[PDB]
Design an enzyme around this catalytic site. Structure first.
Site, short mmCIF file in Angstrom:
data_model
loop_
_atom_site.label_atom_id
_atom_site.label_comp_id
_atom_site.label_asym_id
_atom_site.label_seq_id
_atom_site.Cartn_x
_atom_site.Cartn_y
_atom_site.Cartn_z
N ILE A 83 -32.26 -33.69 -96.55
CA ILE A 83 -32.40 -32.47 -95.80
C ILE A 83 -33.90 -32.11 -96.34
O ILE A 83 -34.56 -32.77 -97.43
CB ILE A 83 -31.62 -31.36 -96.86
CG1 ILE A 83 -30.00 -31.87 -96.55
CG2 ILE A 83 -31.96 -29.96 -96.22
CD1 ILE A 83 -29.36 -31.84 -98.09
N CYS A 84 -34.55 -31.21 -95.52
CA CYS A 84 -36.14 -30.94 -95.71
C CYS A 84 -36.25 -29.85 -96.34
O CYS A 84 -37.67 -29.22 -96.40
CB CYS A 84 -36.59 -30.97 -94.39
SG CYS A 84 -38.42 -31.37 -94.70
N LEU A 85 -35.49 -29.08 -97.05
CA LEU A 85 -35.87 -27.87 -98.13
C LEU A 85 -36.93 -28.37 -99.15
O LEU A 85 -36.75 -29.41 -99.73
CB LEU A 85 -34.66 -27.54 -98.66
CG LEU A 85 -34.73 -26.07 -99.39
CD1 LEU A 85 -35.21 -25.18 -98.37
CD2 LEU A 85 -33.17 -25.69 -99.90
#
Ligand code: CA
Ligand code: ZN
Ligand code: ZN
Lengths: 145, 9, 388
Positions: A83-85
């Site tokens: 995930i790119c958070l």
């Protein structure tokens, strides 16, 4: 460290977040399964996604490693489920709680940022709604359901 | 590497 | 002072620009380490630029801000003074040892100080001077009661105030105090300069007896010395391990930088991780590292200011305490590790945690306070009394 993860699992039970939850798998306090229900703002609506959370030995000073186990269609989610958070990387800070990381991912689920994507194909599309909604919706039917 | 070093101990 | 308009500001630009040009002379060969002027001046211009663009047609109320005004009159008097240091210096500028060159070096420093201050007051380009956070509780408390929310005051107004609190023995000792605390050499005390000084000279409890002892009567104290100058001065002593001097750090203002000659004949400089200067000196001495102030066999006894009057223990109010029973924890415990009690207070933000955690977060490369993320300008060791 160990105590902190124990406080977290404790604080998560006392008052938990909506559309999601998590907890240890087996006897290992450093591995958690976490559930995320599809937000209604989003195309994934009605879906159930599971993630693994691995606390590195450096935690809380380094962030937990969070990944989606259940296939999802997002410009910010890899087929690896990475995930790119940002608060999972540069923006992490030690007093942040797992509930916040979870909410932040639902928040990300309903509002993805294509200008920094993890999937180049879906970034281009996202930034044509009708096709991106449609496919996200379908992948949820196959995988999430 | 700004020219400063860890304190002597 | 007087009011600041666009027409003036464009003049400062030309004056700064000349000074740049005078400093790019291939005969000068300015060494590139801070403070390095061809860095400072353009970066000042840059930040001046950011400030201006933020006030749009609001340039009205920017020129009427006391701090900004004092700053421009001072930036103008400081370049004029540098440009005039070149005309009257002629070729003595290209001798690394000359008194004229020494005055350029002192100016570089004043410029770094001015730039640090500017950015302390206009962090994003917007004037924050009124909300500026003084790092030390008791120092912040003095400034508030005395000057309220003022950003800048006359040196006279500052002496009168401080004297009522911390008596100044004579006129001479006041000049010495002035020279030390006025870093931008403008005849005012900004809330930023006040902060630096009380960081350097803590605890506020005995502020002057501290500064008397670490500066006034200490042979190891070097004022307005550069990193490189500290290197050069110890050289004469490189055959004599244990010789040390200390100065202000220019890159981290409010912090001390101790230069020393190692048992093997090298010169190191160190900036004490936040701690009070006298303890680093006392420990350094006791452990054999800092022996001979400015190389002299005789080293001062600092155990006098050793134990200040202890900062009172924090006590939990019933209303606070009852919540942590609910929260399934206890007020005095570190919420980072959930392990150790909170032994440390971060300043200015106020947040409590354990030193063991604050260290790990800093060593991990982490920026600022782990909670609010704000800058860590200070630490005050503390102990909590549980409400039970
Ligand atoms: Ca001043
Ligand atoms: Zn801790
Ligand atoms: Zn804080």
């Amino acid at each position: 460290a160990l105590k902190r993860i124990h406080k977290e699992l404790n604080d998560l039970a006392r008052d938990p977040p909506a559309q999601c939850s998590a907890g240890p798998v087996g006897d290992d306090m450093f591995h958690w399964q976490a559930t995320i229900m599809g937000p209604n703002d989003s195309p994934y609506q009605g879906g159930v996604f599971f993630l693994t959370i691995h606390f590195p030995t450096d935690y809380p000073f380094k962030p937990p490693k969070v990944a989606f186990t259940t296939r999802i269609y997002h410009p910010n989610i890899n087929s690896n489920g990475s995930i790119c958070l940002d608060i999972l990387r540069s923006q992490w800070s030690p007093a942040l709680t797992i509930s916040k990381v979870l909410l932040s991912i639902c928040s990300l689920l309903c509002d993805p940022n294509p200008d920094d994507p993890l999937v180049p194909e879906i970034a281009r599309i996202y930034k044509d709604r009708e096709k991106y909604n449609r496919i996200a919706r379908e992948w949820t039917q196959k995988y999430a359901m | 590497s700004d020219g400063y070093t860890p304190e002597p101990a | 002072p007087g009011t600041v308009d666009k027409k003036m500001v464009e003049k400062c630009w030309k004056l700064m620009d000349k000074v740049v040009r005078l400093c790019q002379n291939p005969k000068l060969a300015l060494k590139n380490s801070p403070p390095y002027i061809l860095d400072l001046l353009p970066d000042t211009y840059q930040h001046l630029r950011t400030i201006l663009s933020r006030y749009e047609g609001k340039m009205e109320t920017l020129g009427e801000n006391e701090y900004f005004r004092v700053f421009m009159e001072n930036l103008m008097k400081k370049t004029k003074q540098t440009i005039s240091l070149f005309k009257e210096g002629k070729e003595r500028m290209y001798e690394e040892n000359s008194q004229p060159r020494r005055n350029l070096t002192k100016l570089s420093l004043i410029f770094s100080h001015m730039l640090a201050e500017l950015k302390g007051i206009f962090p994003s380009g917007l004037f924050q001077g009124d909300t500026f956070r003084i790092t030390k509780a008791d120092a912040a408390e003095f400034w508030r009661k005395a000057f309220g929310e003022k950003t800048i005051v006359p040196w006279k107004s500052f002496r009168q105030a401080l004297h009522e609190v911390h008596p100044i023995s004579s006129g001479l000792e006041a000049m010495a105090l002035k020279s030390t605390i006025d870093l931008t050499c403008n005849d005012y005390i900004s809330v930023f300069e006040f902060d630096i000084f009380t960081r350097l000279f803590q605890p506020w409890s005995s502020l002057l007896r501290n500064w008397n002892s670490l500066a006034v009567t200490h042979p190891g104290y070097m004022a307005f010395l550069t990193y490189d100058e500290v290197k050069a001065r110890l050289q004469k002593f490189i055959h004599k391990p244990g010789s040390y001097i200390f100065r202000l750090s220019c890159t981290r203002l409010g912090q001390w930088a101790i230069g020393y000659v190692t048992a093997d004949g090298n010169i190191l400089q160190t900036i004490p991780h936040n701690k009070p200067l006298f303890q680093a000196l006392i420990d350094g001495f006791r452990e054999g590292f800092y022996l001979f102030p400015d190389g002299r066999n005789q080293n001062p006894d600092l155990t006098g200011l050793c134990e200040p009057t202890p900062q009172d223990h924090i006590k939990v109010t019933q209303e606070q305490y009852e919540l942590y029973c609910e929260m399934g924890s206890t007020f005095q415990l570190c919420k980072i590790c959930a392990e150790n009690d909170k032994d440390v207070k971060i300043e200015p933000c106020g947040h409590l945690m354990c030193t063991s955690c604050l260290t790990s977060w800093q060593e991990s490369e982490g920026q600022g306070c782990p909670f609010c993320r704000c800058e860590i300008k200070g630490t005050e060791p503390i102990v909590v009394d549980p409400f039970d």
